């Protein structure tokens, strides 16, 4: 009954906005639908395999992620709507030229979930959206904003079905592409996560590597103290699913420092922010261990940060196990 | 170049078959695509949900399982070529009318994975197609056959893009459906494991229930005993994302039997013969811990069987401990 | 490499507008999308038939011309551009709420060739948009404006491939439906009409009832005066494709007046203006016979007007027997 | 509820078949979905516009034409059903490799109405199929056999929805192919056209060409002796679409000799044959004018013949004609 387009346009519409934010998710919308109609055949279309490059963050690329992000970075600056953008992809951070130049700072991972390609793991791509505030000439130094001065964020997981996923101002909002007419539909509106949940999701293939809070609390998970049921065990490997399943069902998703990355995996800019924004407007929580997420000033577009998510009762806990060990 | 269609028919057509076998395999693919397109759309047809009833094994059901189920049911009764269906859905095996009455006996998971469907996890279809060896009339002991009898079975899988993968004594194929068309095409051949993995997939919720040899095992791939780099881990959730991951990349997944399920989870008729099939062909190995999946002989239709398979040197390393256990 | 959307926005963008106009377009297109996707499998959903009623202007309604009409409607008044629609379907305008209301009027054929429904032929949907001129509220006269008056113009073509055709005062672009991601793309810009072209298209069956200009024009189309080749004919009954196959290919479609239809058959405000509209931005005629039909000021919303209208050398040819005749 | 695959299948059910006509006629349904997606989208594709080349019966090859083709010619070959075809595009019949071949000379028009296809008209694929009569090696001659001898035939009409009508022994019926899961299903059973229709279907562009008898019909058309209301006219100029909308309405489809051709323009193989064939299963008549059809002996594949058909009334009528100017 209603379309992501409608949704966007009647928001805007109380946000008294210029239609320059609404044209941006327009076409973020647009190549979503593209990225999801070449993922559904990827294989068919040999789009699986390396393109033949490592990025800045040392990752092999894939065809995907090369296809994705030219969809992206195209659709962005024809959108009118932007001025600088950041991808996992480049090395530095895209100006837009004068003509198609817009008030928007846009950090994105065309295609999250790259170990997971070749074997048909969900996958997708994730956005966050900022406003530019220096008056400067457009540079990467609008992208080292914290994530707190998020204006949009979210994500599209390219799963059993494709979802998009907004957070705004105004909360959180789920919209599901239809293959058939081509529009992402609303099917779940001002989404709040549990308080509390029954899942931990984890790769405890680094447990040597954890620290003394992380190993605890995945000990009690496993051996409750109040001889409750044990919770239950999620890692699909892709950060945009994992997620996903935690605003859903919650429960806890957990990629922190550990001994040989201080600054743990995921990448600050276009992973741990967004996820930080989605997961707080729901009213869940996104911590490093040590602070929260969305108020890390960064000082470089691809730094990584620890990242600890999800219902707010348990990353609490976690918070109270690297509290006591502090 | 080569759809499911013109691969199943030349490959009967050096089977020497009659096209009963044929007709089974074709009936079998419509039914998946139709899966495969209310999966991408179902939260906007509205199949998410329970649909009022819970199945034999203890669990609740979806909507999605019950219009899948009535699909495979209806193009498989009017394929011509079965005489007895066993569905995870149906309390008691299924006998096909004599008209329509074929030789196969086909046992099946409509859809795998329920507990992933509204977070859109990958979800999938498993199936296994049997002769009927008996001369009496068809009945329920026509589908209480050894896996090793089995003369087909595969997976339907419904993740970023749908596979349809497909074992036979002739070994593994797998095969993209190509939406546009409507047609699986072939995209990878004779498909064969690594003889050894990086990656184990097991619920490690169920740490406190664990037997010795799951628990040491485990703490082997986390802390390597010839110091090598410990392994990662992945639990999709769904029995059929985790194989499949198994089988292009290599490694472990388990599903054993613990303190509280002698007989583990996973149903041995529909999902631990299907896949411990697939597994052999492709020369992955599939045991219970103590004895070879296809090797037992089924006492019940709807009865649970531990399971580990995957990479034949880690699947064997883990049998040694059970051995030492023992 | 262009979508309609963008293409409307850069437009839109030269234009200096507010965004009503692009928003009003962008919504036509999303019901235009739907329409073509129920098209396309019609007979399998059941739309083929009548609704069981008789519009104003004495004609079977069919079921698809219910679910077209709905779907224009809806989308128009969501748009917030809107504040008079006119549709075939309905007996009088249709005034939009104030909360929704723009400052538009859009009159439309939901569904245009009913008549080739039932047998595949191509069918479409035509819309001609104009700015409210008034002062007093939105009402009926509103939409009694002379098709000269018309900011915008078009219509979609369901035919062997999906086309929405676009006219406003730079000129006239057509934009195909890939059904694979859902959006229009711009396959023609700037179309001009031929000044002479080689096929006529009439219904011949109302010979009996033609004036003598057209019986003479006829005769000299089969029986050329300077023994050129004779003009070949083609009338699809479908006026969108009919004049959509003038526009491209060129040549004059006809739909006169005659001995018992004074105005002819096809109406004023939602059929005869816009094609009048298109074809005049390409380069080309329409006319009654006796006066331009973009001059007439219109009486009734669903008054019907004859119409002669193709390449300028061709209409003006039968424009000289009318005067020869007068 | 019945899908194109399961009626052949239970056709051939019935008629004993071994097989080989079911895998045929499922090949020829692969290439059919195949087209029918192009065909949607070949503006995208950039399948419109000329090939390069000219066939035997003197025609500008299009794109599509080369497409289409080769996409009916290997999935003929690859069905191991066939030993002899005849395609329009190709000048001498093409014999089938010993491997792949099979006992059935399939005869067939790729794509049907190129005039048509830059202005998005409907246009189609006509076939028809023989059993192989001669014990000789494969050649030419074996598709030199009068259409009675038909075992089937039919075409698919790519319209507004893509149909393919298929006929033979036991009668006509119609499939839509649903675009979302890519399977013909069954709309329209034992399909039967009218004894009298209302619409006649002709090009009176080449009015200074007819014979007297055509001339004479026509007329009677526009002013009914019996002062009944005239027929109607509806020319599409695409074969397929004129005599699809003739069976499903009723009424007569005309492409006659004249004085610049004694045969006609329509093809005998592959166009008049096949809708010769459908039109007499459906209770219709189809003739030169002079002879039936199907009786005519062709002694070159690509040889032309008159063709009148429709509902039998009607072509009766214009027969009586002929005969009284005989
Ligand atoms: N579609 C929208 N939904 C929600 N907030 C919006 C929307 N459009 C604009 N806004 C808000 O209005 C501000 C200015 O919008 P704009 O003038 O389009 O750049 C944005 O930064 C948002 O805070
Ligand atoms: N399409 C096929 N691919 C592989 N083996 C086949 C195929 N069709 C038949 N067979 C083999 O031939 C046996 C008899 O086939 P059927 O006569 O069709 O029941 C089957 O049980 C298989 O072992
Ligand atoms: N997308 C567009 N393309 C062309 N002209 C436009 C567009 N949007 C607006 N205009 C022109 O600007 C006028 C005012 O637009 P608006 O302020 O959106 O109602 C319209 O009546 C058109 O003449
Ligand atoms: N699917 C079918 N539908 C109708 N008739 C069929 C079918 N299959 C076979 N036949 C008839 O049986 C004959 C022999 O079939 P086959 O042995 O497959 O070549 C054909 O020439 C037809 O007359
Ligand atoms: O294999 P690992 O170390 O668990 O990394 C998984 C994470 O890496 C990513 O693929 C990013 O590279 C995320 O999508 C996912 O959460
Ligand atoms: O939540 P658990 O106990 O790990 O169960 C997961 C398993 O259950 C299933 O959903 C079957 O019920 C499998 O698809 C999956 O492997
Ligand atoms: O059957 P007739 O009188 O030629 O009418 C055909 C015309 O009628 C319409 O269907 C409108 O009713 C047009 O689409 C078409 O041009
Ligand atoms: O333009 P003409 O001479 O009427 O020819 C139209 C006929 O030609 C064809 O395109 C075959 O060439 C048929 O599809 C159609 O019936
Ligand atoms: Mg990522
Ligand atoms: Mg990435
Ligand atoms: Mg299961
Ligand atoms: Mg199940
Ligand atoms: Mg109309
Ligand atoms: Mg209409
Ligand atoms: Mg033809
Ligand atoms: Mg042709």
Do not use: W
């Given at each position: 009954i209603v379309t992501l387009t409608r949704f966007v346009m009647e928001?805007?519409?109380?946000?008294?906005?210029?239609?320059?934010?609404?044209?941006?998710?327009?076409?973020?919308?647009?190549?979503?639908?593209?990225?999801?109609?070449?993922?559904?055949?990827?294989?068919?279309?040999?789009?699986?395999?390396?393109?033949?490059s490592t990025n800045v963050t040392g990752?092999?690329?894939?065809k995907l992620d090369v296809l994705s992000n030219d969809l992206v970075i195209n659709v962005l600056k024809?959108?009118?709507?932007?001025?600088?953008?950041?991808?996992?992809?480049?090395?530095?951070?895209?100006?837009?030229?004068?003509?198609?130049?817009?008030?928007?700072?846009?950090?994105?991972?065309?295609?999250?979930?790259?170990?997971?390609?070749?074997?048909?793991?969900?996958?997708?791509?994730?956005?966050?959206?900022?406003?530019?505030?220096?008056?400067?000439?457009?540079?990467?130094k609008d992208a080292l904003q914290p994530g707190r001065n998020l204006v949009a964020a979210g994500y599209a997981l390219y799963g059993s079905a494709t979802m998009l996923v907004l957070?705004?101002?105004?909360?959180?909002?789920?919209?599901?592409?239809?293959?058939?007419?081509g529009?992402?539909?609303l099917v779940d509106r001002d989404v709040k996560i549990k308080k509390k949940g029954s899942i931990y999701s984890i790769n405890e293939g680094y447990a040597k590597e954890f620290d003394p809070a992380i190993?605890?609390?995945?000990?009690?998970?496993?051996?409750?103290?109040?001889?409750?049921?044990?919770?239950?065990?999620?890692?699909?490997?892709?950060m945009v699913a994992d997620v996903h399943r935690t605003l859903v069902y919650g429960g806890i998703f957990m990629y922190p420092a550990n001994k040989k990355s201080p600054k743990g995996k995921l990448?600050?800019?276009?992973?741990?922010?967004?996820?930080?924004?989605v997961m707080e407007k729901?009213?869940?929580?996104?911590?490093?261990?040590?602070?929260?997420?969305?108020?890390?000033?960064?000082?470089?577009?691809?730094?990584?940060?620890?990242?600890?998510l999800g219902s707010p009762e348990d990353v609490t806990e976690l918070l109270e196990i690297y509290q006591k060990h502090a």
């Open positions: 928001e805007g519409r109380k946000a008294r906005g210029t239609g320059e934010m609404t044209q941006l998710l327009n076409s973020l919308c647009t190549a979503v639908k593209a990225i999801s109609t070449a993922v559904r055949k990827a294989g068919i279309l040999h789009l699986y395999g390396i393109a033949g990752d092999q690329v894939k024809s959108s009118f709507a932007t001025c600088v953008l950041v991808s996992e992809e480049d090395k530095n951070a895209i100006i837009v030229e004068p003509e198609k130049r817009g008030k928007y700072v846009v950090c994105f991972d065309p295609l999250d979930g790259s170990s997971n390609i070749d074997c048909l793991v969900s996958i997708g791509t994730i956005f966050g959206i900022y406003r530019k505030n220096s008056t400067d000439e457009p540079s990467e957070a705004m101002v105004n909360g959180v909002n789920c919209f599901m592409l239809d293959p058939a007419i529009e992402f539909i190993t605890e609390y995945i000990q009690r998970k496993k051996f409750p103290p109040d001889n409750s049921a044990p919770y239950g065990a999620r890692y699909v490997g892709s990448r600050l800019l276009y992973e741990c922010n967004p996820m930080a924004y729901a009213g869940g929580l996104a911590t490093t261990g040590k602070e929260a997420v969305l108020d890390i000033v960064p000082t470089d577009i691809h730094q990584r940060a620890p990242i600890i």
